[model samples]
Target: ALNRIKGDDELFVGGVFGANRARLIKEHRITHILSVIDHTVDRENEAFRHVKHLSIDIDDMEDQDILIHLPKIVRFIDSGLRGIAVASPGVVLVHCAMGKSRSVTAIIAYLLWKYPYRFGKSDPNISAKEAVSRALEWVRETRPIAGPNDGFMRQLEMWWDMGCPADS
Candidate 1:
């Protein structure tokens, strides 16, 4: 069984290792796969078992600036089981050239979504910046460099503060 990436009920397919794990994800209960790689893995109804592949550019390892596209990704993630490729408890594996940058940003967004109350303006009464700080602190406690830089995180913080602009 693929171990859950703490706090995330959905399993992950990470690292810049290789594509050998694609089959494994298909076999699992994962109904959707979020690939942040360079190219979209063709999903013509074969090995993926008809799973939907959300091809979003999140490879921060290749270019840290990719984070600029985070707003769109957040929307995609929220689209839920009705967006591009609906998946229940859908799995989003953000893999970069090193499984550090690009994917981490996406994961951070997911964390914010999962625990909105933890950092949302309402609910738990926390802001994105606060939430990110707490989340990053938690990350460093367990794994180093798992969190984005202060600048990148701040951008997200701004988005959250501004109610996540559609074109942010």
Candidate 2:
């Protein structure tokens, strides 16, 4: 099976496409997949019969407005968490072509939503800078290749700075 980052029981990140991709999915028992790039995954694939696919057509361009879709992507992820009966919480795989830019950005966006107080005290208002830094550090601890581009990182910090608005 293809090796990738198992960020946690609820999240994973990878770039395994082609034949080995299915094997990796099965091996990890992934129940949901969030594709950040166009045509990176097959929703009808038999191997993913038990998995839910949320496809967002995000280009790998450094200037793309990935932040605009942050709420939608995280909403899809939150919805995917439901409607699946797994022994444990379902695992969601967020990936792009390289698992570097787009996917990393999306995952960071999700982290900011899930853990606003990651690196701070009991303050309700946390700094976006710290949130992004902690998320990057957590993901890169296992997924060394996980690095969002400058543009994407900038947008993530902006989103966090704006108080991480929920999907509306």
Candidate 3:
């Protein structure tokens, strides 16, 4: 179960520490981790020391102003998408405390940047609503626990309205 739902080719979402974390990391060959909140993990531990990590400190409060951090977060995930391999692309794990709201919203932001209008349409008329909705749907399909809540969802809406920055 969790081994299947953590994420897919580009990104995986999970809690700070969960079952089979190390095994899954080796299986997936994960190369990057973006922690939405700072946790008391031993990055110096040999298990995780090799993987690149970026920690963003932000509360899950309704008025946290997550919009300001969108560009930076997207860029960090973008960096993770680099260095392709013959068999599969490198993987990034984006997570927070519960792998529900903040981490989910961050992944949605990345999706809007990666795939506008659900990777189809081939048109310039992509609506922000369409992009955000598609992002939510894609993520939820894999991790059913992901619901970005009203506040973060509103910020996502605003992010879409702003033309999905860091898209290039």
Candidate 4:
């Protein structure tokens, strides 16, 4: 099943199968598609023509660096989920091969960027890595399969320790 990424339900993390289904997309009011996979989605579908899509072509590997792309990704997600008013009131579905790791990493980054307080970032006792851990655990609360690669985990620590920068 396609699950909402976080508590607010504005962002989602799921597999490409559900993301490609027009019926599911329409019913959920999803407006933007953020794919972290290496290939393009099915453009043959007429329903997808009107949708906003951002594909970050990257390999699904522990050695692959998704951290460098985190800043821009969070902002792109923010634009869609944080009052873009484009369509469907800015619901964005973030997907990779599965709803588990790659997509989950992106969602966790968004959580830290959009709501630092949610992960207790204000607490001095909570180290940067801890905040990043909490963010991942937070995603796992709804998405049980959520888990980023080890490399991305290290970078997420860096991202949180660096204020989850939203620069390009």
Clashing pairs in 3: none
TM-score of each: 0.65, 0.82, 0.81, 0.90
**For every candidate structure, what is the RMSD over all alpha carbons to the true structure, in angstroms?**
4.6, 3.2, 3.6, 2.0
> What would the per-residue lDDT of candidate 2 be over residues 8-90, giving only the tens digit for each residue?
44677766462227777877777788888875456577777667677788787779999889998877666665543453456
Candidate achieving the largest TM-score: 4
The number of clashing residue pairs in each candidate reads 2, 0, 0, 0
| Per-residue lDDT over 1-168 for candidate 3, one digit per residue giving the tens place of the 0 to 100 score | 222332345677877765126766666667777788775445665657678778889888788877888898888877777643353345777888788888888888888777664633255666666667777877888888888878888899888878777744
Report the C-alpha lDDT of model 1 over 19-72, residue by residue, as the tens digit.
335555665555555555665564554755466556665434433564456666
Compose the digit string of candidate 4's lDDT tens values, residues 9-126.
5788888788778778878787788897764656677767677889898777888889888977888788877655254358888998877778888888888888899888678798
Task: Using lDDT, rank the candidates from best to worst.
Answer: 4, 2, 3, 1
* Segments of candidate 4 deviating more than 4 angstroms: 83-88
Task: Please give the ranking of all candidate structures by TM-score, highest first, separated by commas.
Answer: 4, 2, 3, 1
> Considering summed lDDT, which 10 consecutive residues are worst modelled in model 3?
1-10
Determine which window of 10 residues in candidate 2 has minimal summed lDDT: 1-10
lDDT of 2: 0.73
The candidate maximizing lDDT is: 4
lDDT of candidate 1? 0.55
Model 3 ranges with Cα > 4 A deviation: 1-8, 84-89, 119-127
